[PDB]
Design a protein around this motif. Structure first.
Motif, PDB file in Angstrom:
ATOM      1  N   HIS A   1      67.794 119.455   3.955  1.00 39.18           N
ATOM      2  CA  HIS A   1      67.100 118.191   4.172  1.00 39.18           C
ATOM      3  C   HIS A   1      65.632 118.429   4.513  1.00 39.18           C
ATOM      4  O   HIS A   1      65.312 119.193   5.423  1.00 39.18           O
ATOM      5  CB  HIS A   1      67.775 117.402   5.295  1.00 39.18           C
ATOM      6  N   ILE A   2      64.745 117.769   3.776  1.00 34.87           N
ATOM      7  CA  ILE A   2      63.311 117.909   4.000  1.00 34.87           C
ATOM      8  C   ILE A   2      62.611 116.555   3.956  1.00 34.87           C
ATOM      9  O   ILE A   2      62.398 115.989   2.884  1.00 34.87           O
ATOM     10  CB  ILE A   2      62.667 118.839   2.954  1.00 34.87           C
ATOM     11  N   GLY A   3      62.256 116.041   5.128  1.00 33.84           N
ATOM     12  CA  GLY A   3      61.582 114.758   5.204  1.00 33.84           C
ATOM     13  C   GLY A   3      60.113 114.897   5.560  1.00 33.84           C
ATOM     14  O   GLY A   3      59.463 115.857   5.146  1.00 33.84           O
TER      15      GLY A   3
ATOM     16  N   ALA B   1      61.857 120.078   8.751  1.00 33.59           N
ATOM     17  CA  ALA B   1      62.470 121.266   8.169  1.00 33.59           C
ATOM     18  C   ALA B   1      63.942 121.369   8.555  1.00 33.59           C
ATOM     19  O   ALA B   1      64.299 122.082   9.492  1.00 33.59           O
ATOM     20  CB  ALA B   1      61.719 122.515   8.604  1.00 33.59           C
ATOM     21  N   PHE B   2      64.790 120.652   7.827  1.00 35.31           N
ATOM     22  CA  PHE B   2      66.224 120.662   8.094  1.00 35.31           C
ATOM     23  C   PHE B   2      66.971 121.458   7.028  1.00 35.31           C
ATOM     24  O   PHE B   2      67.998 121.017   6.513  1.00 35.31           O
ATOM     25  CB  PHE B   2      66.762 119.230   8.152  1.00 35.31           C
TER      26      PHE B   2
END
Length: 14
Positions: free
Chosen positions: A4-6, A10-11
């Motif tokens: 996940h990258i929003g 930095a997920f």
């Protein structure tokens, strides 16, 4: 896995 990258979230986790 879970990637996940929003707005600067930095997920990235394999």
């Amino acid at each position: 896995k879970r990637i996940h990258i929003g707005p600067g979230r930095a997920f990235y986790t394999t």
